């Protein structure tokens, strides 16, 4: 679908796809390589059988590319889009099968050599929600995985419901933030930080709880292990450069609540040349604050710009169909409960537990998107415009 006029340019059909199959779309090669065609890969997996297949197509013309995808004999579990590229500027894609072997694509000689030289720096994490298990596997030289780390959230009291990790295609402009005082506070930009959110299997209105763990993706260290009491799902979490924001229901007072977790390091950065998840002995400090949202929610996703210069906004998807553009600066956890000279220097609004849903903030005016399912945000060009596609029953751009 052309993003400007909304017309349809090409349609294709995948024969024999079950309704409950799980998909995963990856842009393997963009259009900045004119001598080579753009190429995308779609990964389907029938739930009943378990067999998964890969369909590779040109995303511009819609015809299947002549590059034959490999026949995935074993059922697969997870996929990775490594930033390393082949000679034809195709991003390497990795699949982990059921026998925990690794299949590459395009898996040419150059790709195999490149990822064999870079093997020990590639980690998979598989979150088995049925058993409440999390595993993290290395990548050996000969394309095999070993049990690097393993955690178990007991399913008898907690089931994993969301594993939202930070988007790979984003950049952070300001590593730190000005605190006033002529000093700087450094954000804890960890690129391998999961945000696994679990619900309490106890459905009683008074004993239910919702846990959020900021599990690292490489070393398995639990950065944060928050557990909110007297709360019930569904929970909608967005994970961004530094912060995480997860909306939930509060059973005790019957009101939807936000809870912003901001990760901050010390006044001086531990290391600036490079970041390694194996070399972070200082647990980042966590700043939390809970706000009241006066309505329900259906989908969230932060607005993303190419260089991250533009401020961040959350696209709250209300049941009414509107798309509220809540400024992230409002959800700062450092907003003091009593204003001080430091806050005035930093221009921090005093803490207000109520978040307004003023109708002038909606990014759509009356094109309500009934039964909203998700919000996709694309960086686009420029620096102030982020493309928004709210998909559900209706589809709006």
């Amino acid at each position: 679908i052309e993003s400007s006029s909304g017309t349809i340019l090409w349609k294709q059909y995948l024969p024999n796809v079950k309704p409950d199959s799980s998909f995963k779309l990856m842009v393997q090669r963009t259009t900045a390589h004119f001598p080579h065609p753009p190429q995308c890969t779609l990964l389907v997996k029938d739930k009943e059988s378990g067999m998964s297949s890969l369909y590779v197509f040109n995303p511009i013309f819609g015809k299947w590319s002549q590059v034959a995808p490999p026949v995935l004999k074993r059922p697969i579990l997870q996929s990775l889009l490594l930033p390393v590229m082949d000679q034809d500027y195709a991003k390497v894609l990795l699949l982990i099968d059921d026998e925990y072997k690794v299949t590459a694509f395009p898996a040419t000689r150059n790709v195999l050599r490149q990822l064999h030289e870079l093997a020990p720096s590639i980690f998979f994490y598989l979150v088995d929600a049925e058993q409440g298990r999390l595993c993290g596997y290395r990548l050996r030289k000969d394309l095999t995985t070993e049990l690097s780390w393993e955690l178990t959230i007991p399913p008898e009291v907690q089931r994993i419901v969301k594993v939202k990790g930070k988007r790979s295609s984003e950049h952070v402009h300001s590593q730190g933030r000005v605190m006033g005082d002529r000093s700087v506070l450094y954000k804890s930009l960890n690129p391998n930080l999961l945000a696994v959110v679990t619900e309490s299997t106890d459905a009683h209105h008074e004993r239910t709880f919702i846990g959020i763990f900021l599990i690292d993706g490489v070393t398995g260290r639990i950065i944060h292990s928050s557990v909110q009491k007297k709360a019930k799902g569904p929970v909608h979490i967005v994970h961004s450069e530094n912060w995480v924001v997860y909306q939930y229901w509060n059973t005790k007072a019957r009101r939807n609540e936000f809870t912003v977790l901001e990760l901050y390091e010390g006044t001086e950065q531990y290391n600036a040349t490079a970041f390694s998840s194996l070399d972070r002995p200082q647990l980042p400090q966590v700043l939390q604050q809970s706000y009241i949202f006066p309505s329900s929610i259906s989908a969230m996703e932060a607005t993303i710009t190419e260089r991250g210069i533009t401020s961040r906004h959350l696209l709250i998807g209300l049941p009414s169909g509107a798309i509220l553009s809540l400024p992230k600066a409002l959800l700062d956890p450092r907003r003091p409960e009593i204003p001080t000279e430091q806050s005035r220097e930093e221009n921090l609004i005093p803490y207000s537990p109520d978040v307004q849903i003023h109708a002038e903030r909606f990014i759509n005016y009356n094109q309500t998107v009934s039964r909203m399912r998700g919000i996709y945000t694309a960086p686009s060009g420029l620096e102030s415009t982020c493309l928004v596609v709210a998909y559900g029953l209706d589809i709006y751009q």
Partner: protein
């Protein structure tokens, strides 16, 4: 113009008439297990308060909403100071 919602268990629920043409103020409704049930104005802060509103909800609209924001269009008198 009236409305009826069925299959409601006992508790507290915020009722809102969503309509893109004209907004409607939400109203909280507390229904008990015995059967008596009441309406009031929602207040997510200090929820213990009670501001009774008649049960046959007369949720009169407040005109069309204000999704749009008018252009600035500053004048020379604005440039003066």
């Amino acid at each position: 113009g009236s409305f009826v919602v069925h299959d409601i268990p006992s508790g507290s629920y915020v009722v809102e008439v969503v309509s893109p043409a004209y907004r409607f103020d939400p109203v909280r409704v507390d229904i008990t297990s015995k059967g008596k049930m009441r309406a009031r104005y929602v207040n997510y802060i200090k929820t213990s308060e009670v501001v009774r509103l008649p049960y046959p909800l007369q949720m009169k609209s407040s005109g069309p909403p204000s999704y749009f924001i008018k252009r600035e269009s500053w004048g020379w008198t604005d440039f003066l100071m």
